[PDB]
Amino acid sequence: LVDNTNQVEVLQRDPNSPLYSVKSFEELRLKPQLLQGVYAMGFNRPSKIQENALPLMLAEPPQNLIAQSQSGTGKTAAFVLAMLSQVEPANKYPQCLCLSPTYELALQTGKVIEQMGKFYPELKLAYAVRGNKLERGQKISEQIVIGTPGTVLDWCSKLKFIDPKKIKVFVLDEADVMIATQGHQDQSIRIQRMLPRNCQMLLFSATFEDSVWKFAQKVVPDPNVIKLK
């Protein structure tokens, strides 16, 4: 984790209902196997960004979020949690959905999930990325699906691999890198419109140009907002 002398700014979706700043994971009341997962990874104290992110994300019920912080802050960790803490392994079908901007980050965020979910039994990942093997007629029984948006949108729409009206969580990672990639922005927006209202929408980005901002607002309704200097 990179050091951060500057402080986080938290625009809460509900101004008159403050809740922030967990300075420990034990405070969070995480599934025992998840909190073990966390320990396993050498995580000690939550990171600056997680302190504020996780409460919102892990609220009862959970809240939506748009988050802006630089690399090595703990974005991924933070959402890996988001998802795993909603995922019921015993239910063999996708419930959590993660759009990545490159193939080579869908795999990297995979490893982080798989490592963290280590102590969930029968937890399996699906990778909706260029050159997966899945023939038609098939349906996915993996509870999480990481991938890049087209291939994912293909999975919900055309190929009927995934029924998105069963997703509980939806992350968008690197929302800046995403918009600057052909197709992606529109592709993601079309995935999103078929998710169910209750689904949690989490969106993350290094930078935050108007474009990115404007984009966030089509995708993440009733959002809490976080920016770190």
């Binding site: 260029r130 890049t148 087209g150 197709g183 529109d186 927006i189 089509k218």
Partner: peptide, 17 residues
Amino acid sequence: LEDSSRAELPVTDKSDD
């Protein structure tokens, strides 16, 4: 074709196809 190599019409800014 690859994700970012397709010919598809954008989403209207009112969010429709």
